[PDB]
């Protein structure tokens, strides 16, 4: 019919930074924006590409906040538009951490993802 063989993924980076200076947490989090974009481009999107129906993700954006907390909670999100439903949420989450089922040391503990739309057209 009009079937949805794909779902939409939102990947997130979550980092806590020291803020003993008691500065604006948007400026503290800003310090690793470039680092997060480079991570997304050179590791995260490459890891997940083999699961995409038609390649494409949004620009990484930081969640804005209003606090100068002693520890700054920082969050970035990017959307991957079209991933085959063949690949479940856990399977995709795992792919962030390990690139072999017999890998001893996980990577990217600061990265997680969700299905942000459970029904999208694969376009393929």
Residues lying near Ni ion in the complex (CB under 5 A): 2, 21
Between 24 and 43, name the residue whose CB sits nearer to Ni ion. 24
- Give the C-alpha separation, 101 to 110, whole Å: 20
Between 103 and 119, name the residue whose CB sits nearer to Ni ion. 119
Alpha helices in 20-69, H assignment, sequence order: 25-30, 33-39, 45-49
In the bound state, the residue with its beta carbon closest to Ni ion is 2
Between 2 and 34, name the residue whose CB sits nearer to Ni ion. 2
- Give the C-alpha separation, 7 to 15, whole Å: 26
- The least distance separating Ni ion from the CB of residue 22, rounded to whole angstroms, comes to 7
- The least distance separating Ni ion from the CB of residue 39, rounded to whole angstroms, comes to 28
Question: Is 43 within 8 Å of 57 (Cβ atoms)?
Answer: no
- The least distance separating Ni ion from the CB of residue 3, rounded to whole angstroms, comes to 5
Q: For residue 26, how far is the Cα from the chain centroid?
A: 19
């Amino acid at each position: 019919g009009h079937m949805h063989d794909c779902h939409q993924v939102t990947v997130s980076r979550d980092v806590t930074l020291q803020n003993k200076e008691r500065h604006d947490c948007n400026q503290v989090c800003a310090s690793i924006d470039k680092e997060t974009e480079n991570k997304l481009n050179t590791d995260i999107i490459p890891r997940l590409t083999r699961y995409m129906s038609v390649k494409g993700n949004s620009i990484i954006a930081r969640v804005q906040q209003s606090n100068s907390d002693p520890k700054c909670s920082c969050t970035w999100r990017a959307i991957i538009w079209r991933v085959y439903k063949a690949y479940d949420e856990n399977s995709l989450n795992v792919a962030l951490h390990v690139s072999h089922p017999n890998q001893q040391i996980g990577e990217n503990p600061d990265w997680s993802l969700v299905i942000s739309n459970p029904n999208v057209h694969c376009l393929k």
